[PDB]
Structures are given as C-alpha cells and as structure tokens.
C-alpha cells in the first residue's frame, strides 16, 4: 500500500534534524575556537608579564 | 670657639656621607622611576587585553 | 519487501545522536572556557589598582 | 683662625648636617617606596603564575 509517503516525511524531518544539530554543532565549535584562541593569547600575555 | 682640626675632620666626613647618601638616593630614585614606568606600561597592556577578552565574550 | 531501509533510517538517527552528543560536549567546553576567560579578565582587572 | 675660616667652617658643617638629614630622609622614604613596590610586584607575579596554571589546566582538560 502507501507506506512510502509518510516515511519520506519522517526522513525529511530527520534531514532537518541533521541540519539543525550539525549547524549548532559547528557554531559551537567556532565559539570554542575563538574562546580557546583568546585564552591562549591571554595566557601568553600573562607569561610575558613574568619576564 | 671650636676644635679647628675636629671641625675640619667633621666637614670632610660629612661631605663623604652626603655624597654617599646622594648616590644611594639617586640610585634608589632611578630604580623606583623605572619600576613606575614599567608598571605603567604593564597597566596599559593589561587594559588592552581586558578589552580584547570583553569583546570576545560580548561576541558570544 | 525491502527491510534494509530500517538501518539507513536508523543510521541517520544515529547521526543525529552523534552530532547532538558532540554538540552538548562542546557546550560544556564553551561554558568552562567562558568561565575561565571571565575569571582571568577579572584577575587582570584586579591588577589595576 | 688657624688654617681655615672658623666661622665659615662652622656654617658649612651646620649646612652639611642639614643637607645630610634631608638627603637621608629622602633616601629612606624612596627606599621604602621601592621596597613596597618590589613586594607588591612579587605578590602579583605569584598570582600571575597561579592564573597561568589554571588556564593551562583548563586548556589541557579541553
Ligand atoms: Zn677653627
């Protein structure tokens, strides 16, 4: 019968779920990259104060 | 009246002590001035670093 | 009669689980790094006195 | 009187003593300011060390 129809819908919702999860995951990685680089710069600065 | 030899000796000793104390004060004053200068530079750079971090946290 | 699609649809749902898992771990990381940057900026400010 | 001007060396000794008290006080005050500055800087450097260690500990655990 007609089981292909609803399954396509569920798979498209799953596609939107991968888009959202991967999108917010990459955004989080970009944040973590900026914060890590800033912490490294600041630690380097603090180290420069000990010379 | 005074003891002439005694006041000559004291004059020379006072001049010696005054020169030694002048040199000590000039050396200490220069060390403190350099320290104040270095600290001022440090505080300027610290301000710039604080600004960078608050800009980063703000962009989050 | 195909059957096999269950794995492929579940693999996609397993991919959502993996992405969400790494994302939540990343959120914990960002929280720790943010807190450390706030502490460190507070410390640097404390040096200005 | 003898080989010097007695009044002149009396005045010069008195002035040298005044200058020496003033210069001693300046040197002691400046030295105390320097000692306080060095102490505060030493404390700052200890705290800076602990902060660097905390940051590297965080970064390593990340
Ligand atoms: Zn005399």
Residue numbers in the entry:
A (entry chain D): 494 to 544
B (entry chain B): 1081 to 1140
C (entry chain C): 496 to 544
D (entry chain A): 1079 to 1140
Pull text from the paper.
We show that scaffold assembly requires conserved leucine zipper (LZ) and Cnn-motif 2 (CM2) domains that co-assemble into a 2:2 complex in vitro.
Intriguingly, all of the individual LZ substitutions, including L535E, perturbed the assembly of the apo-LZ-homo-tetramer, and strongly reduced the α helicity of the proteins. To better understand why the L535E substitution did not more strongly disrupt the LZ:CM2 interaction, we generated LZ-L535E:CM2 crystals and solved their structure. Although L535 is packed within the core of the LZ:CM2 assembly, there is sufficient space in the core to accommodate the longer E535 side chain, and E535 also forms a hydrogen bond with the invariant CM2 T1133 residue in the core. This presumably explains why the L535E mutation only relatively mildly perturbs LZ:CM2 assembly in vitro and Cnn scaffold assembly in vivo. Most strikingly, however, the L535E substitution could still form a detectable, although less robust, Cnn scaffold; this is in excellent agreement with our analysis of the behavior of the LZ-L535E:CM2 complex in vitro.
